[PDB]
Structures are given as structure tokens and as C-alpha cells.
């Protein structure tokens, strides 16, 4: 029994984890064969990053310019190059400690597990949702930049993020491994905002279940609702739309706790418009968005 | 910016875990140099869980009676011993994998990660408070037993939990890695009621400068109080006494922010009577207390 916030284990990407050096620039890599990822604001002083040419930044440098330190180790660069907003630091020494892993670009309301770095040091391990305005709430100090998010799917590593920037209101931005941000955000110092925060609603959902399957179970009502009547409600709250597919994703735990997706919609709605008259949910006194359905399924079954 | 529930790297921890089957039962063991430790409740039965002898059980059983796998690999068992709660076996080998590890027994309030494990694989990490009436709400299902909870230093690991069983409320029982049952817990299946749970007053105050440091401003009032004037209010909403240690522990964030001690004493009076309103701090729309003064720092520098 019980239901916590719970990241995967680290130990894989702890080993893939490197320093990166230019200049007074100093920030995380992440070092997976023969090739070291970083953010390519690497290469940028002060002076640019009101509006850098990072084309033009990169040429001044050359291989030899890149500090490529691993655990107290040196690394040689054999071929540098620019994917988007990333470095593909060519070593010649391959990472011993390269775990299965693959590259993935993760939808908005997916979970994934931040190793966040400092020198290159593993520093600590948190669990986090991509919001739906592409921002992620994270905890980043300076140098935090290059740190990853990662989901482990049986014995591969699969990276979805790659942290960048903090903006003006203090949430952060990212990329894919290939170096594509998520939401609209570029890799300059200019007036950035963030969207709307909507909530995403599936997770909600999926959180309520995992909640009754612990036996905290006083939210549920008399009442039932529909999908368009439902979807309605959300909209007045800035709760994301309840699709079919999000019905069926929810079919799991339907099964299980033997209550209905529009059943538990029904109790939801009141708990939006009737607040939670001071009471608490697993220990929460708001709902919880940062778990999926599979989040649910994998902490409440194995 | 940003500040959440952070655990330490899991990744040191990861290399020591084992799987320990002893008749049917199956658990997480700790392998390290040539010992192995788990929950000395693995070589019970189900007709044996009301009330079991753990001497008069371990004696019927043998070195063989023991299987230890590491991964795809088998462990040879050549010593048993029991240390109150835990089995001590004695293996063949030396874990190559073994950190720079000490055991430490942790005090009611102090926080630390689990890695939660089934069958000796790592399946997942949160960060956990060791909690006033000596219980953990932890994440734990059927096969969690011998997860061990840890704080990192470096590279210095230190082992201060063990889990053993779940209480009929919810809530998770386990010993330091001597075998000693924080709180009057028992390793068997009896009636067993946690102590009444406080909140842990100088985490709460750790939060609030956190909070602080994030920009979050709004529950700062223009009030002071006094350590009595404060322990009074805090002994009335069941709040863990605050003492003069804990005053000394806050310096760093109350040089930090400005705000000293008694202010932000002031001002967490002030959402104990008048509650909070509907308003939230980082995030939160319930005061947290399983953040500690380290944390903090550790988190915000
Ligand atoms: C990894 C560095 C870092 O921690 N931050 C950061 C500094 C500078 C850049 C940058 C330099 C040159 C050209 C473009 C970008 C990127 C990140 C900061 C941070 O994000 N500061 C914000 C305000 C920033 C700086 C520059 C451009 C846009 C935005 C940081 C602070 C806290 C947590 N994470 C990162
Ligand atoms: C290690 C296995 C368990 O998960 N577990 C457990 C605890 C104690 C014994 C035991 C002790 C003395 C003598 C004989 C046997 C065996 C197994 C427990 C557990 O059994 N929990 C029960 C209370 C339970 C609760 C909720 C749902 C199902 C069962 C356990 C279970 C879950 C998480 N942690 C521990």
C-alpha cells in the first residue's frame, strides 16, 4: 500500500554523465558511445546571448576548445557538429557504461525522471510531467544545464529531455536529444512567456484511482456525467479536454477499483466546483497532474 | 529556481541489492563486502506469523536453506547469524560493487531516499522522513521488504533504514541496518498501533525559507514571538517542540533571507490559526514537513 512521487532508478545515466568546458562556460553532458551531448549555448559569453549567431559562435571555436572532462578523466574530440540547439562532441574514447538507450520526443502530460547535475556530478533524482504549455516544474541551479530526463522502459534508457534555460517566471525549458525545444522557447536571452498551465485531466483521473486503491476513497459521489458535459466543466477550471483515447488509457484501473471513467469524471467535477472543503487526497490538499495512468499501474501492481 | 522532493543518485545503492528466497519466501537482501543482510522474517511460514520464535525457527534451518542471487548470478552461503531483526549471511564473495558505506540509526524528523526493490531488482526512488511516532509513509507493495532507505556524502553512502512490514493503517515499519526497530514495532502479526503523528516543526520553518527564497512572500507578516510564546501554539495544532539546536540549524537560510528565526516563527503562527486560505506555497496548498534544514541548502545552494 501507499502511492509517492517516484523517479527510476539513476544508476544507468549517473555513468553517462560528463563535464563540459568553454571558457568560463561550464555546464552537464551526457556521453553515450562515441558522441557527447550538450546544450550549444556552451560556446556563448554575456555579451551574446541578447542575440547570438551560434553558426558564427561555433566557427571561432574548434574540437580542441571543448573541455570534455569525465570523472577526472580528459576526452579527445574528433569531430564536433551542431543538431538544432545541441552538441555532438565526437570522442575518441567510447562510453564502457552505455546502457540499451534510445532518443524519444515525449507528448505533453508524459512523466519522465530528472537526474539534475552539477560539474557533471549526479546531484539528485526527481519525477516530472512536460505541462502543456512545454514547460516542465523542475529545481535547476546555475550549471544545471545539460542535466536529462529519462524513462526506463525494461533495460533501455529512453532520454526525452535536456535542460536549457530557466524562464522569467522560473519554470524551465528543454529539448529532445536531437536538440528541438518543446513548446515555443529559443536559446536566447529575450522576452520569453510560457502559455496557460492548464491541468492535465487524465492524470488527475488516474491519481483519483490510485487513491481509492489505497482506501482513501471519501471524494466518491452519487452522481454520474458525460463526456461533453464533463469536458465542459474542465474547460471552466483550465483543465485539458478528456478525450476517448484518455477513457480508454484509464481502462486499467476502471477494471481493477470496478468504477466507471465517467463515475469518477462525476466526483471530479464536484470537487473542482465544491474545492475539497479542507479535506486531502493521498496526503494532498490539491490534485495531483504529474502522475500518468502508467505511473499508476506500475507503483500499484509492481 | 524551483524547489521539489529531490532523492539522492540511486546508482551506489543499485550494485548492493540481492534477492533472498528461504522456503517459499522471497525478499531484498544488502550485499555488502561478504555479508549479506535482509529481514530475518524470511524463513517464516504462514503458520507462523501470529507469533513466531525466530530462534526455534532459524535453528531448523542451514546454510543451503539460504538461496542468494546477485543479478543472473548465485551467491554460496556459508554462514547465518541473527542480529535482533536482520539475517547476517556470510557469502563466498566480496561485492566488487560495494561503496564506502557506514550504518547510522536516524532521528524522528530527519529525512532520507528509498530504493524501493522486488525480487532484488530496483524498480523505483523518493525521497522519505523518518516521522515523530517512528513510522515512514512510504510506497511499498507485497515483495518491498529489505529496501533500504540511505543519505549520500560524496561518495560515502550511509544505510539508516531497512523496511519490514506495512501497519493495518497504511504506513511502513523497518530497523536501522543493526536490526533495531525504530518506534515499539514488532516483526510479527499482531495488533500494533503507530503513536499519534506530530509535524515536524523545523522542517515546516525550512519550507517557509525555501518558499522564501523562490520569491513565495506573501505569508511573511510584521509580527514577532518568542521560543515559549511559539512551542505554546505549537504543542496546541500537535507541532513538535521547537528548540534552541533547532533555532542554531536555520542560521545559513536566516542569514540567507534576511528573516531571522522568531520572524518566520511569527508568521507560521499566524497559517496555524488563521489557516491558509485557499492560497499556496511552492506549489502546495498544505504546509510540508518532510523537507529538513539540509535539504534546504543542499537544494538552494
Ligand atoms: C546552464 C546555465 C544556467 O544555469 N542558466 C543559463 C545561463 C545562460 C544561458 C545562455 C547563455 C548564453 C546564450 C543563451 C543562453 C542559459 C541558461 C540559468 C538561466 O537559465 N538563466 C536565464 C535567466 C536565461 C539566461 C540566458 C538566456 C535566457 C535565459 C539557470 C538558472 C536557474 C536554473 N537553470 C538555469
Ligand atoms: C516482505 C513482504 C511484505 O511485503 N510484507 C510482509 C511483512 C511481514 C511478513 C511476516 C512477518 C513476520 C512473520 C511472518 C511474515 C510477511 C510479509 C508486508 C505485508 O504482508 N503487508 C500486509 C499488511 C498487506 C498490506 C496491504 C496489502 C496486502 C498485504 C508488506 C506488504 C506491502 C508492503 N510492505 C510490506
Not at 546502457?99 to 502530460?109: H, L, N, S, T
Not at 485539458?240 to 467535477?269: F, N, Y
Not at 490539491?286 to 500499484?300: A, G, K, M, S
Request: charged share 15%; glycine share 8%; net charge negative.
Amino acid at each position: 500500500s501507499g502511492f509517492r512521487k517516484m523517479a527510476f532508478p539513476s544508476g544507468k545515466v549517473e555513468g553517462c554523465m560528463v563535464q563540459v568546458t568553454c571558457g568560463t562556460t561550464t555546464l552537464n553532458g551526457l556521453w553515450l558511445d562515441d558522441v557527447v551531448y550538450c546544450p550549444r549555448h556552451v560556446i556563448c559569453t554575456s555579451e551574446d546571448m541578447l542575440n547570438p549567431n551560434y553558426e558564427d559562435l561555433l566557427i571561432r571555436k574548434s574540437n580542441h576548445n571543448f573541455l570534455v572532462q569525465a570523472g577526472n578523466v580528459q576526452l579527445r574530440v574528433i569531430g564536433h557538429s551542431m543538431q538544432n540547439c545541441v552538441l555532438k562532441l565526437k570522442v575518441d574514447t567510447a562510453n564502457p557504461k552505455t546502457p540499451k538507450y534510445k532518443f524519444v520526443r515525449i507528448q505533453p502530460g508524459q512523466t519522465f525522471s530528472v537526474l539534475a547535475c552539477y560539474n557533471g556530478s549526479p546531484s539528485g533524482v526527481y519525477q516530472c510531467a512536460m505541462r502543456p504549455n512545454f514547460t516542465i516544474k523542475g529545481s535547476f541551479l546555475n550549471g544545471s544545464c545539460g542535466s536529462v530526463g529519462f524513462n526506463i522502459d525494461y533495460d533501455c534508457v529512453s532520454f526525452c529531455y535536456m535542460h536549457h534555460m530557466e524562464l522569467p517566471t522560473g519554470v524551465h525549458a528543454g529539448t529532445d536529444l536531437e536538440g528541438n525545444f518543446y513548446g515555443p522557447f529559443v536559446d536566447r536571452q529575450t522576452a520569453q512567456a510560457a502559455g496557460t498551465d492548464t491541468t492535465i485531466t487524465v492524470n488527475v483521473l488516474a491519481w483519483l484511482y490510485a487513491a481509492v486503491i489505497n482506501g482513501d476513497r471519501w471524494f466518491l459521489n452519487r452522481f454520474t456525467t458525460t463526456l461533453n458535459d464533463f469536458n465542459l466543466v474542465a474547460m471552466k477550471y483550465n483543465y485539458e479536454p478528456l478525450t476517448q483515447d484518455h477513457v480508454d488509457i484509464l481502462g486499467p484501473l476502471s477494471a481493477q477499483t470496478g468504477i466507471a471513467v465517467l463515475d469518477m469524471c462525476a466526483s471530479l467535477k464536484e470537487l473542482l466546483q465544491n474545492g475539497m472543503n479542507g479535506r486531502t487526497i493521498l496526503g494532498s490538499a490539491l490534485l495531483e497532474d504529474e502522475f500518468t495512468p502508467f505511473d499508476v499501474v506500475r507503483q500499484c501492481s509492481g
